[PDB]
Coordinates of C-alpha atoms in Angstrom, one line a residue:
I4 CA -70.3 -32.7 -6.3
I5 CA -68.1 -35.3 -4.5
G6 CA -64.3 -35.7 -4.8
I7 CA -63.4 -39.3 -5.9
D8 CA -59.7 -40.3 -6.1
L9 CA -59.6 -43.3 -8.5
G10 CA -56.1 -44.8 -8.1
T11 CA -54.1 -47.8 -9.5
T12 CA -54.1 -49.9 -6.2
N13 CA -56.2 -47.8 -3.7
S14 CA -59.3 -45.6 -3.7
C15 CA -60.4 -42.7 -1.5
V16 CA -63.3 -40.2 -1.5
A17 CA -63.8 -36.7 0.0
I18 CA -66.0 -33.6 0.4
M19 CA -65.7 -29.9 1.6
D20 CA -67.5 -29.6 4.9
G21 CA -68.3 -25.9 4.3
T22 CA -64.8 -24.6 3.6
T23 CA -63.1 -27.5 5.6
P24 CA -61.9 -30.7 3.9
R25 CA -63.5 -33.9 5.1
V26 CA -62.3 -37.4 4.0
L27 CA -64.9 -40.1 4.2
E28 CA -64.9 -43.7 5.4
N29 CA -66.6 -46.8 4.0
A30 CA -69.3 -48.9 5.7
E31 CA -66.5 -51.4 6.8
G32 CA -64.7 -48.4 8.5
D33 CA -61.9 -48.1 5.9
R34 CA -60.9 -44.7 4.3
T35 CA -58.4 -45.7 1.6
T36 CA -60.2 -48.7 0.1
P37 CA -58.4 -51.3 -2.3
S38 CA -59.3 -50.7 -6.0
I39 CA -60.0 -54.5 -6.3
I40 CA -63.2 -56.0 -7.8
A41 CA -63.9 -59.7 -7.6
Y42 CA -66.8 -61.8 -9.2
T43 CA -67.3 -64.7 -6.7
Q44 CA -67.8 -68.0 -8.5
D45 CA -71.5 -68.3 -7.4
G46 CA -72.3 -64.9 -8.9
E47 CA -71.6 -62.3 -6.1
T48 CA -70.0 -59.0 -7.3
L49 CA -67.6 -57.9 -4.5
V50 CA -65.5 -54.7 -4.2
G51 CA -62.6 -53.7 -1.9
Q52 CA -61.4 -55.6 1.2
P53 CA -63.9 -58.5 0.6
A54 CA -62.5 -58.6 -3.0
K55 CA -58.9 -58.9 -1.7
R56 CA -59.8 -61.3 1.2
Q57 CA -60.8 -64.0 -1.3
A58 CA -58.3 -63.0 -4.1
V59 CA -56.3 -66.3 -3.7
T60 CA -59.6 -68.3 -4.2
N61 CA -60.8 -67.1 -7.6
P62 CA -58.0 -65.1 -9.3
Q63 CA -59.1 -65.6 -12.9
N64 CA -62.3 -63.5 -12.1
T65 CA -60.5 -61.0 -9.7
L66 CA -60.0 -57.6 -11.3
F67 CA -57.3 -55.3 -10.0
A68 CA -55.1 -52.4 -11.3
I69 CA -57.7 -51.5 -14.1
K70 CA -56.2 -47.9 -14.4
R71 CA -53.4 -49.5 -16.5
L72 CA -56.0 -50.8 -19.0
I73 CA -58.9 -48.4 -18.7
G74 CA -58.8 -46.9 -22.2
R75 CA -55.9 -48.6 -24.0
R76 CA -56.1 -50.9 -27.1
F77 CA -55.0 -54.5 -27.5
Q78 CA -51.7 -53.6 -29.3
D79 CA -50.1 -51.1 -26.8
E80 CA -46.9 -51.4 -24.6
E81 CA -48.9 -51.6 -21.3
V82 CA -51.6 -54.0 -22.5
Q83 CA -49.0 -56.3 -24.1
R84 CA -47.1 -56.5 -20.8
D85 CA -50.3 -56.7 -18.7
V86 CA -51.4 -59.7 -20.8
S87 CA -48.1 -61.3 -19.9
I88 CA -48.4 -60.8 -16.1
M89 CA -52.1 -60.2 -15.1
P90 CA -53.9 -63.4 -13.9
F91 CA -57.4 -62.3 -15.1
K92 CA -58.5 -63.0 -18.7
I93 CA -57.7 -59.9 -20.7
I94 CA -59.0 -59.8 -24.3
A95 CA -59.2 -57.7 -27.5
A96 CA -62.5 -56.0 -27.9
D97 CA -64.6 -56.1 -31.1
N98 CA -63.3 -52.5 -31.7
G99 CA -59.6 -53.4 -30.9
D100 CA -60.0 -51.9 -27.3
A101 CA -58.4 -53.7 -24.3
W102 CA -61.3 -55.5 -22.6
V103 CA -61.8 -58.2 -19.9
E104 CA -63.4 -61.7 -20.1
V105 CA -65.0 -62.7 -16.7
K106 CA -66.8 -66.1 -16.2
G107 CA -67.1 -66.2 -20.0
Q108 CA -68.7 -62.7 -20.5
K109 CA -66.9 -59.8 -22.3
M110 CA -66.8 -56.4 -20.5
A111 CA -65.5 -52.9 -21.2
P112 CA -63.3 -51.7 -18.3
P113 CA -65.2 -48.4 -17.5
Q114 CA -68.0 -50.9 -16.6
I115 CA -65.5 -52.7 -14.2
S116 CA -64.0 -49.5 -12.8
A117 CA -67.6 -48.3 -12.1
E118 CA -67.8 -50.9 -9.2
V119 CA -65.2 -48.8 -7.4
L120 CA -67.2 -45.7 -8.1
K121 CA -70.5 -47.3 -7.1
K122 CA -68.9 -48.3 -3.8
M123 CA -67.3 -44.8 -3.4
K124 CA -70.7 -43.3 -4.3
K125 CA -72.5 -45.5 -1.8
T126 CA -69.7 -44.6 0.8
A127 CA -70.3 -40.9 0.1
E128 CA -74.1 -41.2 0.0
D129 CA -74.0 -43.2 3.3
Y130 CA -72.3 -40.2 5.2
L131 CA -74.4 -37.4 3.5
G132 CA -77.7 -39.4 3.6
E133 CA -78.9 -37.7 0.4
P134 CA -78.5 -39.3 -3.1
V135 CA -75.4 -38.0 -5.0
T136 CA -75.6 -37.4 -8.8
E137 CA -72.2 -35.8 -9.5
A138 CA -68.4 -36.3 -9.3
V139 CA -64.9 -35.0 -9.7
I140 CA -62.4 -37.7 -10.5
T141 CA -58.6 -38.0 -10.6
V142 CA -56.2 -39.1 -13.4
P143 CA -52.4 -39.0 -14.2
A144 CA -50.9 -36.1 -16.2
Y145 CA -49.9 -38.2 -19.3
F146 CA -53.4 -39.6 -20.1
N147 CA -55.0 -38.7 -23.5
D148 CA -58.7 -37.9 -24.3
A149 CA -59.6 -41.6 -24.8
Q150 CA -58.2 -42.4 -21.3
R151 CA -59.7 -39.2 -19.8
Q152 CA -63.2 -40.0 -21.4
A153 CA -63.0 -43.7 -20.4
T154 CA -62.9 -42.5 -16.7
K155 CA -65.8 -40.1 -17.4
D156 CA -67.7 -43.0 -19.0
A157 CA -66.9 -45.0 -15.9
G158 CA -68.4 -42.1 -14.0
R159 CA -71.6 -42.0 -16.1
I160 CA -72.1 -45.8 -15.8
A161 CA -72.1 -45.2 -11.9
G162 CA -74.8 -42.5 -12.2
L163 CA -72.2 -39.8 -11.4
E164 CA -72.1 -36.8 -13.7
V165 CA -68.4 -35.9 -14.1
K166 CA -68.5 -32.1 -13.6
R167 CA -64.7 -31.9 -14.1
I168 CA -61.9 -34.5 -14.5
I169 CA -58.7 -33.3 -13.0
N170 CA -55.1 -34.5 -12.9
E171 CA -53.3 -36.2 -10.0
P172 CA -50.5 -33.6 -9.8
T173 CA -53.1 -30.7 -10.0
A174 CA -55.0 -32.6 -7.2
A175 CA -51.7 -32.9 -5.3
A176 CA -51.0 -29.1 -5.7
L177 CA -54.6 -28.2 -4.8
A178 CA -54.5 -30.6 -1.8
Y179 CA -51.6 -28.9 0.0
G180 CA -53.5 -25.5 -0.5
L181 CA -51.6 -24.0 -3.5
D182 CA -54.8 -22.4 -5.0
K183 CA -53.6 -18.8 -4.2
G184 CA -51.4 -16.6 -1.9
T185 CA -48.2 -16.4 -4.0
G186 CA -47.6 -14.8 -7.5
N187 CA -46.0 -18.0 -8.9
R188 CA -45.0 -21.4 -7.5
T189 CA -42.9 -24.1 -9.2
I190 CA -43.9 -27.4 -7.7
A191 CA -42.4 -30.9 -7.8
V192 CA -45.0 -33.7 -7.2
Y193 CA -43.3 -37.0 -6.1
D194 CA -45.9 -39.8 -6.4
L195 CA -44.7 -43.2 -5.1
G196 CA -47.9 -45.1 -4.8
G197 CA -49.2 -48.6 -4.3
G198 CA -47.9 -50.1 -7.6
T199 CA -46.6 -47.1 -9.7
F200 CA -44.3 -44.1 -9.6
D201 CA -44.8 -40.7 -11.2
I202 CA -42.7 -37.5 -11.1
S203 CA -44.6 -34.4 -12.3
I204 CA -43.0 -31.0 -12.3
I205 CA -45.7 -28.4 -12.6
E206 CA -46.1 -24.5 -12.7
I207 CA -48.8 -22.6 -11.0
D208 CA -48.8 -18.9 -12.2
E209 CA -51.1 -16.1 -11.0
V210 CA -49.3 -13.3 -13.0
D211 CA -51.5 -13.9 -16.1
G212 CA -54.4 -12.7 -13.9
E213 CA -54.9 -15.4 -11.3
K214 CA -55.0 -18.3 -13.9
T215 CA -52.6 -21.0 -14.8
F216 CA -52.3 -24.6 -13.6
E217 CA -49.8 -26.1 -16.1
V218 CA -47.8 -29.4 -16.4
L219 CA -44.1 -28.6 -17.3
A220 CA -42.6 -32.0 -17.3
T221 CA -43.7 -35.6 -16.3
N222 CA -41.9 -39.0 -16.1
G223 CA -42.6 -42.2 -14.2
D224 CA -42.1 -45.9 -14.0
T225 CA -44.1 -49.0 -14.6
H226 CA -42.4 -51.5 -12.2
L227 CA -40.5 -49.1 -9.7
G228 CA -39.5 -49.6 -6.1
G229 CA -41.3 -52.4 -4.3
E230 CA -41.1 -55.5 -6.5
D231 CA -37.3 -55.6 -7.1
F232 CA -36.6 -54.3 -3.5
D233 CA -39.0 -56.1 -1.3
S234 CA -37.8 -59.2 -3.4
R235 CA -34.3 -58.7 -1.8
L236 CA -36.0 -58.8 1.7
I237 CA -38.5 -61.6 0.8
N238 CA -35.5 -63.7 -0.4
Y239 CA -33.4 -63.0 2.8
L240 CA -36.4 -64.0 4.9
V241 CA -36.7 -67.2 2.8
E242 CA -33.0 -68.0 3.0
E243 CA -32.9 -67.2 6.8
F244 CA -35.9 -69.5 7.3
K245 CA -34.3 -72.2 5.0
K246 CA -31.2 -71.9 7.2
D247 CA -33.0 -71.8 10.6
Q248 CA -35.9 -74.3 9.9
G249 CA -34.6 -76.5 7.1
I250 CA -37.7 -76.0 4.8
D251 CA -38.4 -73.9 1.6
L252 CA -41.2 -71.4 0.9
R253 CA -40.6 -70.6 -2.8
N254 CA -42.7 -73.8 -3.4
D255 CA -45.6 -72.3 -1.3
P256 CA -47.9 -69.7 -3.1
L257 CA -49.7 -68.8 0.2
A258 CA -46.5 -68.4 2.2
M259 CA -45.0 -66.2 -0.6
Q260 CA -48.2 -64.0 -0.6
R261 CA -48.2 -63.8 3.2
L262 CA -44.4 -63.2 3.3
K263 CA -44.9 -60.5 0.6
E264 CA -47.7 -58.6 2.6
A265 CA -45.9 -59.1 6.0
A266 CA -42.3 -58.2 4.8
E267 CA -43.6 -55.2 2.8
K268 CA -45.2 -53.9 6.0
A269 CA -41.9 -54.7 7.9
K270 CA -39.8 -52.8 5.3
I271 CA -42.0 -49.7 5.7
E272 CA -41.4 -49.8 9.6
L273 CA -37.6 -50.2 9.3
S274 CA -37.3 -46.8 7.7
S275 CA -38.7 -45.2 10.9
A276 CA -37.2 -47.5 13.7
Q277 CA -34.2 -49.7 14.2
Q278 CA -36.0 -53.1 14.3
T279 CA -39.3 -55.0 13.8
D280 CA -40.1 -58.7 14.0
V281 CA -41.4 -60.7 11.0
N282 CA -43.8 -63.0 12.9
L283 CA -45.9 -65.4 10.8
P284 CA -47.9 -68.1 12.7
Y285 CA -48.7 -71.3 10.7
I286 CA -46.5 -70.4 7.7
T287 CA -45.8 -74.0 6.4
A288 CA -46.0 -77.6 7.7
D289 CA -44.0 -80.8 7.2
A290 CA -43.4 -84.3 8.6
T291 CA -42.0 -82.6 11.8
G292 CA -45.4 -80.8 12.3
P293 CA -46.1 -77.0 11.6
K294 CA -43.5 -74.3 11.2
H295 CA -44.0 -71.0 13.0
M296 CA -41.9 -68.1 11.5
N297 CA -40.5 -65.4 13.8
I298 CA -37.5 -63.6 12.1
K299 CA -35.9 -60.4 13.6
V300 CA -35.1 -57.8 11.0
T301 CA -33.2 -54.4 11.5
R302 CA -32.7 -51.3 9.5
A303 CA -29.0 -52.3 9.5
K304 CA -29.6 -55.8 7.9
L305 CA -32.2 -54.1 5.7
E306 CA -29.9 -51.2 4.5
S307 CA -27.4 -53.9 3.4
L308 CA -30.0 -55.8 1.3
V309 CA -31.6 -52.7 -0.5
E310 CA -28.8 -50.8 -2.3
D311 CA -30.7 -49.7 -5.5
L312 CA -34.3 -48.6 -6.2
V313 CA -34.9 -45.4 -4.3
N314 CA -32.1 -44.1 -6.5
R315 CA -34.2 -45.3 -9.5
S316 CA -36.7 -42.7 -8.2
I317 CA -33.9 -40.0 -8.2
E318 CA -32.8 -40.9 -11.7
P319 CA -36.1 -40.0 -13.7
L320 CA -36.1 -37.0 -11.2
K321 CA -33.0 -35.9 -13.2
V322 CA -34.7 -36.2 -16.6
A323 CA -37.8 -34.4 -15.3
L324 CA -35.4 -31.5 -14.5
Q325 CA -33.1 -32.0 -17.5
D326 CA -36.0 -31.9 -20.0
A327 CA -37.5 -28.8 -18.2
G328 CA -34.2 -27.0 -17.9
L329 CA -34.6 -26.1 -14.2
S330 CA -32.5 -26.5 -11.0
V331 CA -33.4 -27.9 -7.6
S332 CA -33.4 -24.4 -6.2
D333 CA -36.0 -23.1 -8.7
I334 CA -38.6 -25.4 -7.2
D335 CA -40.5 -23.9 -4.3
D336 CA -42.3 -27.0 -3.1
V337 CA -41.6 -30.7 -3.3
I338 CA -44.9 -32.4 -2.4
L339 CA -45.6 -36.1 -1.6
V340 CA -48.3 -38.5 -2.8
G341 CA -48.5 -42.3 -2.3
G342 CA -48.4 -44.6 0.7
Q343 CA -44.7 -45.5 0.2
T344 CA -44.0 -41.7 1.1
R345 CA -44.2 -42.7 4.8
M346 CA -40.9 -44.6 4.5
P347 CA -38.1 -42.2 5.8
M348 CA -35.7 -43.4 3.1
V349 CA -37.6 -41.7 0.2
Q350 CA -38.4 -38.7 2.4
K351 CA -34.7 -38.4 3.1
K352 CA -33.5 -39.1 -0.4
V353 CA -36.0 -36.6 -1.9
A354 CA -34.9 -34.0 0.7
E355 CA -31.2 -34.7 0.0
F356 CA -31.8 -34.1 -3.8
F357 CA -34.1 -31.0 -3.6
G358 CA -32.4 -29.5 -0.5
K359 CA -35.7 -28.4 1.1
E360 CA -37.8 -30.9 3.1
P361 CA -40.9 -32.3 1.2
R362 CA -44.4 -31.4 2.3
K363 CA -46.6 -34.1 3.9
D364 CA -48.9 -31.7 6.0
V365 CA -52.0 -33.6 4.5
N366 CA -52.1 -37.4 4.5
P367 CA -50.6 -38.9 1.2
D368 CA -53.3 -41.7 0.7
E369 CA -56.0 -39.0 1.1
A370 CA -54.3 -35.7 -0.1
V371 CA -54.9 -36.5 -3.8
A372 CA -58.7 -37.0 -2.9
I373 CA -58.7 -33.7 -1.0
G374 CA -57.4 -32.4 -4.3
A375 CA -60.6 -33.7 -5.9
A376 CA -62.8 -32.5 -2.9
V377 CA -61.4 -28.9 -3.0
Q378 CA -62.2 -28.6 -6.8
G379 CA -65.6 -30.4 -6.5
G380 CA -66.9 -28.6 -3.4
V381 CA -66.7 -24.8 -3.2
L382 CA -64.9 -24.2 -6.5
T383 CA -67.1 -26.2 -9.0
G384 CA -69.6 -25.0 -6.7
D385 CA -69.6 -22.2 -9.4
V386 CA -66.7 -20.7 -11.4
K387 CA -65.2 -20.2 -14.7
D388 CA -64.8 -20.0 -18.5
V389 CA -64.8 -20.3 -22.3
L390 CA -66.1 -18.9 -25.6
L391 CA -68.6 -17.9 -28.2
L392 CA -71.2 -18.7 -30.9
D393 CA -74.4 -20.9 -30.7
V394 CA -76.2 -23.5 -28.4
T395 CA -78.4 -22.5 -25.6
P396 CA -81.9 -21.3 -25.0
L397 CA -84.0 -18.5 -24.2
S398 CA -83.7 -14.9 -25.5
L399 CA -82.9 -11.9 -23.3
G400 CA -84.3 -8.4 -24.1
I401 CA -86.2 -5.2 -23.0
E402 CA -89.6 -3.5 -23.1
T403 CA -89.9 -0.8 -25.8
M404 CA -92.7 1.7 -26.7
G405 CA -95.6 -0.5 -27.6
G406 CA -95.1 -2.8 -24.6
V407 CA -93.2 -5.2 -26.8
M408 CA -90.0 -7.3 -26.0
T409 CA -87.1 -6.0 -28.1
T410 CA -84.4 -8.7 -28.2
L411 CA -80.7 -8.0 -27.4
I412 CA -79.4 -11.5 -26.9
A413 CA -81.0 -14.1 -29.2
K414 CA -82.2 -17.7 -28.5
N415 CA -79.6 -20.4 -28.7
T416 CA -76.4 -18.3 -28.3
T417 CA -73.5 -19.3 -26.0
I418 CA -71.6 -17.5 -23.2
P419 CA -69.7 -15.2 -22.8
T420 CA -71.4 -12.8 -25.2
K421 CA -71.6 -9.0 -25.4
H422 CA -74.2 -7.2 -27.6
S423 CA -75.8 -3.7 -27.6
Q424 CA -78.4 -1.4 -29.2
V425 CA -79.1 2.3 -29.1
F426 CA -82.5 3.6 -27.8
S427 CA -84.1 7.0 -27.1
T428 CA -86.7 8.8 -25.0
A429 CA -90.3 8.6 -26.1
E430 CA -91.6 12.1 -25.0
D431 CA -90.3 15.7 -25.4
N432 CA -88.7 17.1 -22.2
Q433 CA -88.5 13.4 -21.0
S434 CA -85.8 13.4 -18.3
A435 CA -85.7 9.6 -17.5
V436 CA -86.2 6.1 -18.8
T437 CA -87.2 2.7 -17.3
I438 CA -85.0 -0.2 -18.3
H439 CA -87.0 -3.4 -17.8
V440 CA -84.9 -6.6 -18.2
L441 CA -86.9 -9.4 -19.8
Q442 CA -86.2 -13.1 -20.2
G443 CA -88.6 -14.8 -22.7
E444 CA -89.7 -15.4 -26.2
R445 CA -93.2 -13.6 -26.3
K446 CA -93.7 -10.3 -28.1
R447 CA -96.0 -8.6 -25.5
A448 CA -93.6 -7.6 -22.7
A449 CA -96.2 -8.4 -20.0
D450 CA -96.1 -12.1 -21.2
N451 CA -92.3 -12.4 -20.6
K452 CA -90.3 -13.0 -17.3
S453 CA -89.3 -9.8 -15.5
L454 CA -85.7 -10.5 -14.4
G455 CA -85.3 -6.9 -13.1
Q456 CA -85.7 -3.2 -13.7
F457 CA -83.6 -0.1 -13.1
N458 CA -83.7 3.6 -14.0
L459 CA -81.5 6.0 -15.9
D460 CA -82.5 9.6 -14.8
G461 CA -81.2 13.1 -15.7
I462 CA -81.7 13.3 -19.5
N463 CA -81.2 16.9 -20.7
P464 CA -84.1 19.0 -22.1
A465 CA -83.7 17.6 -25.6
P466 CA -86.5 16.8 -28.2
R467 CA -87.4 13.1 -28.7
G468 CA -85.8 10.7 -31.1
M469 CA -82.5 12.4 -30.3
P470 CA -81.1 11.4 -26.9
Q471 CA -78.6 8.6 -27.6
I472 CA -79.3 6.0 -24.9
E473 CA -77.0 3.0 -25.3
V474 CA -78.3 -0.3 -23.8
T475 CA -75.7 -3.0 -23.5
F476 CA -76.2 -6.6 -22.5
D477 CA -73.1 -8.5 -21.3
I478 CA -73.3 -12.2 -20.2
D479 CA -70.1 -13.3 -18.5
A480 CA -68.6 -16.8 -18.4
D481 CA -70.1 -17.8 -15.0
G482 CA -73.5 -17.1 -16.8
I483 CA -74.0 -13.9 -14.8
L484 CA -76.0 -11.3 -16.7
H485 CA -74.8 -7.7 -16.6
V486 CA -77.1 -5.1 -18.1
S487 CA -75.9 -1.5 -18.6
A488 CA -77.6 1.6 -19.9
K489 CA -75.9 4.9 -20.7
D490 CA -76.6 8.3 -22.1
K491 CA -74.0 9.2 -24.7
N492 CA -74.7 13.0 -24.4
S493 CA -73.8 13.4 -20.7
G494 CA -72.0 10.0 -20.1
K495 CA -74.3 9.2 -17.1
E496 CA -74.3 5.3 -16.7
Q497 CA -76.6 3.1 -14.7
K498 CA -76.5 -0.7 -14.2
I499 CA -78.0 -4.0 -13.0
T500 CA -76.3 -7.4 -12.4
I501 CA -78.6 -10.5 -12.5
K502 CA -77.6 -14.0 -11.5
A503 CA -77.2 -17.1 -13.7
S504 CA -79.8 -18.6 -11.4
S505 CA -82.3 -15.7 -11.9
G506 CA -85.3 -16.1 -14.2
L507 CA -87.0 -19.1 -15.8
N508 CA -86.3 -22.7 -14.8
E509 CA -86.3 -25.8 -17.1
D510 CA -90.1 -26.4 -17.0
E511 CA -90.8 -22.6 -17.3
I512 CA -88.4 -22.7 -20.3
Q513 CA -90.3 -25.7 -21.8
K514 CA -93.6 -23.9 -21.2
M515 CA -92.2 -20.7 -22.9
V516 CA -91.2 -22.8 -26.0
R517 CA -94.7 -24.3 -26.2
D518 CA -96.2 -20.9 -25.3
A519 CA -94.2 -19.0 -27.9
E520 CA -94.6 -21.7 -30.7
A521 CA -98.4 -21.9 -30.1
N522 CA -99.2 -18.2 -29.6
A523 CA -97.1 -17.2 -32.7
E524 CA -100.4 -16.2 -34.6
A525 CA -101.7 -14.2 -31.6
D526 CA -98.3 -12.5 -30.9
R527 CA -97.9 -11.6 -34.6
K528 CA -101.4 -10.1 -34.6
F529 CA -100.2 -7.9 -31.7
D530 CA -96.7 -7.1 -33.2
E531 CA -98.5 -5.9 -36.4
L532 CA -100.5 -3.5 -34.1
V533 CA -97.4 -2.3 -32.2
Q534 CA -95.8 -1.3 -35.5
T535 CA -98.9 0.6 -36.5
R536 CA -99.3 2.3 -33.1
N537 CA -95.7 3.5 -33.3
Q538 CA -96.1 4.8 -36.9
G539 CA -99.2 6.6 -35.7
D540 CA -97.3 8.1 -32.7
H541 CA -94.5 9.3 -35.0
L542 CA -97.1 10.9 -37.4
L543 CA -99.2 12.3 -34.5
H544 CA -96.0 13.9 -32.9
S545 CA -94.3 15.1 -36.1
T546 CA -97.5 16.4 -37.7
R547 CA -98.3 18.4 -34.5
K548 CA -94.9 20.2 -35.0
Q549 CA -95.2 20.4 -38.8
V550 CA -98.2 22.6 -37.9
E551 CA -96.2 24.6 -35.2
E552 CA -93.3 25.1 -37.8
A553 CA -95.8 26.1 -40.5
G554 CA -97.9 28.7 -38.6
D555 CA -99.5 31.5 -40.8
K556 CA -98.3 29.7 -44.0
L557 CA -101.1 27.1 -43.4
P558 CA -104.7 28.3 -44.3
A559 CA -107.6 28.3 -41.8
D560 CA -109.6 25.4 -43.5
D561 CA -106.4 23.3 -43.6
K562 CA -105.6 24.2 -40.0
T563 CA -109.3 23.5 -39.1
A564 CA -109.4 20.2 -41.0
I565 CA -105.9 18.9 -40.1
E566 CA -106.3 19.8 -36.4
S567 CA -109.7 17.9 -36.4
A568 CA -108.0 14.8 -37.8
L569 CA -105.0 15.2 -35.4
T570 CA -107.5 15.0 -32.5
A571 CA -109.2 11.9 -33.9
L572 CA -105.8 10.1 -34.5
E573 CA -105.1 11.0 -30.8
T574 CA -108.4 9.2 -30.0
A575 CA -107.8 6.2 -32.3
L576 CA -104.3 5.9 -30.8
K577 CA -106.1 5.2 -27.4
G578 CA -107.8 2.2 -29.1
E579 CA -106.5 -1.4 -29.6
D580 CA -108.0 -1.1 -33.1
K581 CA -105.4 -1.4 -35.9
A582 CA -107.9 -0.7 -38.7
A583 CA -109.1 2.6 -37.1
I584 CA -105.4 3.7 -36.7
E585 CA -104.5 2.8 -40.3
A586 CA -107.8 4.5 -41.4
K587 CA -107.2 7.6 -39.2
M588 CA -103.6 7.9 -40.4
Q589 CA -105.1 7.9 -44.0
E590 CA -107.9 10.3 -42.8
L591 CA -105.0 12.5 -41.4
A592 CA -102.5 12.0 -44.3
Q593 CA -105.1 12.8 -47.0
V594 CA -105.5 16.3 -45.5
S595 CA -101.7 17.0 -45.1
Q596 CA -101.0 17.4 -48.9
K597 CA -100.6 21.2 -48.5
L598 CA -99.1 20.8 -45.0
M599 CA -96.3 18.5 -46.4
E600 CA -95.6 21.1 -49.2
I601 CA -94.9 23.6 -46.3
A602 CA -92.9 21.1 -44.2
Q603 CA -91.0 20.4 -47.5

């Protein structure tokens, strides 16, 4: 299992290297890869940086920000706004889904988002060397089943089985190590990403027995930070250039795009230094030749352009508390996600509000992928839960007198499940039993798979039929099989624990179905002998004592005749012959008319 972080703007993939988190890097040498897919006009399907690097050249067939659309329907508040702003041809699907039209062909966005996952899968495979067939994947907290399944569908289309699908706040909490080692923590997750903002206030409780990861309150914004802020700076840089160099840029789409990317980088520096220089060679050209742009910007000029939108990240931070009914002191940890959370101004303004400095002790364009890795790796490794009734192949049971499998857990029942049956000793003055744990579907125990065996010794000198030996089969929720046997007279228990990976594999399971379905006639022909052998054993044993109870009440001829037939039954019961046993039981029973009158 690999940990994929599927973002809005940017994608990152990770694994657990033993116990240690490892964050991987693409063939181009990038870690956090852009979640951009572009169908080049002459047919090439590009992903990532080579999808951004041509994005000006073929925008109508450039797909970005698909997490907004992934599993929403044509009439929705996001899709209706996306259709108003997004350059690529969004359409209504034939089911009313929000779909894309590219180069004239209609496609379902799990198919599109798969090209991120196929690149991430390749990126992961390229480090490991072995083919990967499994994933864990991220989502926001406020996504419904259709949006959660759409991401799992995107996984399946990539040949990645989605072995869990986890939330971005859970991933954030896991990433900074909040799996264990407190009784309770109340966390604030501040996600100020590439092109979205989320606040999720979440509770991690261990006091219900080391299990709850719950979302208490979430809020967020659609067009926050960034676009209305960087626009104050873009416009200053335009008006400074218009002033200094006597030419406009709002007319130039390329200069706007380059000014956007350049100034957005500069803004991120100026919250971490006093100054940086907005240098742009060959920005625009006119009758006086080219214009080279070099504008000096400071935090001080910046701070006086940008009085607004960080506060718009402290405003929903109020509702997320007001709806929950908690105070800033009740929160243990304020934890950061998203690449804008390297800008001092948000780190400062979050600290100022919460009072305790936010944690960024794991890199916040990777952490949310480490949150996938730490679940995917050692955890979903193995571990956890759910409930009962039916599914879910082969039967589990034990060997009983006859050499027959007696079934405790039936074929096609789910986990966890607890069932039991009461057994006994087979001989008089028998002080112990073997418990042989069978997996299979055949009658004859020697034809089923021996999972294990154990003993229960120390049964008191009782007569047979009487010692109440309970055998209990318990299958836990990790699939681990626990078999327990107990004497109810003394209370002396013995156990065995058998792994979910013990016993028969898929092909052995298929054989067993073919084996048990084909040999049904042969197995019944045995089961119908086991029944007769056991009836004969009861009669042989009881009629021996019905003589010993009778004594001098029983005449010599009867004693002579009955004891003769008792011997012969004890010979026939060393045969595999049913008919001889049924006959010798009759040859015996016929002569026990007077014996039964005495035993009566």
